[PDB]
Design a protein around this ligand. Structure first.
Ligand SMILES: O=C(O)CCCc1cc2cc(Cl)ccc2n1S(=O)(=O)c1ccc2ncsc2c1
Lengths: 277, 10
């Protein structure tokens, strides 16, 4: 049976440190995102993009961070969307990298191993956190100023219409677990510290930290989800689904490569995907 | 190589 001893009090201190570091690393938390998704907010109320006419008008009324008046934009809706998403991804790599450095012990890992953990973990974190911004109708965009429907994304010409749908599929199942930010902060730390990433050199200290994180997560979930006996194992299984999501997303990307020319990933994304798997 | 990722980490 569970008890309140110096070990558990260390696990909780660890969980709170991750949470605090997570709130200041990631702008739109799932708390704020779900308020928006229910109107339970003041703030703004996002502009809904649900068809081509609302898209055109949304680009005008939403202040997209990456857009300037004006660089050269694709003129084709699907590609302009790809470009915004690629920009958000690059941003997210930096958010996640910063968060990684806040994970006790991470910075003192082999610098080359730090690189490898981020290379493999970043897109699994991206899709993990993207679910915070999704419901079954669509996904929050642009820091929550816009909302793009699932069916609009699905209606983009092939193969762009196939990019987001596997993420929605994942998000429906994953959000039915009802994690909050406090859960998520530990779960993404666990993902970053996967001691089975290809090419790791000094695996021992990585498993040590991941061990300490897996304990802090199990305690976290027992305390925070009284009505969910099998939550810890269900969550670990979701790391399996995320690797599959990343695999599938890679296969669509190479469709883009030998098909859409002019398109090219931001070099940060190119280093990540290069020799991924 | 992962030059940008290396740069971000240092
Ligand atoms: O692969 C990359 O990292 C660059 C390309 C990534 C990417 C291109 C792309 C094009 C379309 Cl039409 C739909 C989804 C797409 N995705 S995504 O599903 O991965 C993604 C990522 C972060 C994000 N923030 C709010 S929505 C969102 C969607």
């Amino acid at each position: 049976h569970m008890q309140l001893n110096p070990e558990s009090a260390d696990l909780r201190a660890l969980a709170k440190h991750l949470y605090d570091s997570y709130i200041k690393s990631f702008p739109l938390t799932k708390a704020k995102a779900r308020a928006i998704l229910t109107g339970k907010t003041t703030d703004k109320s996002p502009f809904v993009i649900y068809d081509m006419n609302s898209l055109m008008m949304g680009e005008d009324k939403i202040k997209f961070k990456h857009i300037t008046p004006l660089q050269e934009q694709s003129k084709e809706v699907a590609i302009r969307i790809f470009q915004g998403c690629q920009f958000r991804s690059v941003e997210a790599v930096q958010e996640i990298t910063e968060y990684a450095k806040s994970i006790p012990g991470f910075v003192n890992l082999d610098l080359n191993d730090q690189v490898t953990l981020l290379k493999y973990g970043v897109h699994e974190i991206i899709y993990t956190m993207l679910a915070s911004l999704m419901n079954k109708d669509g996904v929050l965009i642009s820091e929550g100023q816009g909302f793009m429907t699932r069916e609009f994304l699905k209606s983009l010409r092939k193969p762009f219409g196939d990019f987001m749908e596997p993420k929605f599929e994942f998000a429906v199942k994953f959000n039915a677990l009802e994690l909050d930010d406090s859960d998520l902060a530990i779960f993404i730390a666990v993902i970053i510290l996967s001691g089975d990433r290809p090419g790791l050199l000094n695996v021992k200290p990585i498993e040590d930290i991941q061990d300490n994180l897996l304990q802090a997560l199990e305690l976290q979930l027992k305390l925070n989800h009284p009505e969910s006996s099998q939550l810890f194992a269900k969550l670990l299984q979701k790391m399996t689904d995320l690797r599959q999501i990343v695999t599938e997303h890679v296969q669509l990307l190479q469709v883009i490569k030998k098909t859409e020319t002019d398109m090219s990933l931001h070099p940060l994304l190119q280093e990540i995907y290069k020799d991924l798997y | 190589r992962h030059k940008i990722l290396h740069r971000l980490l240092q």
